[PDB]
C-alpha positions as MATLAB code, in Angstrom:
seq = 'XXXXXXXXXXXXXXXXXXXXXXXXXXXXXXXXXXXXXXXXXXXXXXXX';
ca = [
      10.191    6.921   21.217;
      12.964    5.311   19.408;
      10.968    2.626   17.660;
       8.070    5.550   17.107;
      10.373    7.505   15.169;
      12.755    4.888   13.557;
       9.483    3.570   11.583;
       8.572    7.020   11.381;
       5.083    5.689   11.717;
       3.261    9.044   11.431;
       4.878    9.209    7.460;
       4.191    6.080    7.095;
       0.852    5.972    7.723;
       0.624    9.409    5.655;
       2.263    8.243    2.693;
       0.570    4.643    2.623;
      -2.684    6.315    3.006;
      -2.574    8.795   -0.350;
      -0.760    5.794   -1.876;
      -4.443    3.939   -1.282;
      -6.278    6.832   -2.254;
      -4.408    6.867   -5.468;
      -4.988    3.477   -6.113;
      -8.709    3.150   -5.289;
      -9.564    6.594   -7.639;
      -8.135    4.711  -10.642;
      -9.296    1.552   -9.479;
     -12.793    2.989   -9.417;
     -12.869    4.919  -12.518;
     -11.021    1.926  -14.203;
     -13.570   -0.645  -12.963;
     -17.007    1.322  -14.632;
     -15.550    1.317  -18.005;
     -14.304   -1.959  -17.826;
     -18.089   -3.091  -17.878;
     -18.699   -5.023  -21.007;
     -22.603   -6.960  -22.263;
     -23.042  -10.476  -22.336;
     -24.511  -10.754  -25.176;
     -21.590  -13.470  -26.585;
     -22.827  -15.468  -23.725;
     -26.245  -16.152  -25.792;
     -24.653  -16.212  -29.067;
     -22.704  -19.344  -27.582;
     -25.217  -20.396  -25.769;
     -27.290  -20.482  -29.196;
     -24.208  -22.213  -30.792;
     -23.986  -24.977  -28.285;
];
């Protein structure tokens, strides 16, 4: 009980678990705008 309590491991788990929703909702609205074309890959392509 002692160790269950002195790592209060019910908060713990709480907190770290809306800490990772937090972070994977901005992740995933960061990650579709961060999207970009390719088309600079055939203009250098051209180039070379």
């Amino acid at each position: 009980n002692g160790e269950i309590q002195a790592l209060e491991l019910p908060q713990k788990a709480e907190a770290l678990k809306l800490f990772l929703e937090e972070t994977k909702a901005t992740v995933a609205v960061y990650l579709e705008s961060l999207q970009d074309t390719k088309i600079t890959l055939i203009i250098n392509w051209l180039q070379e």
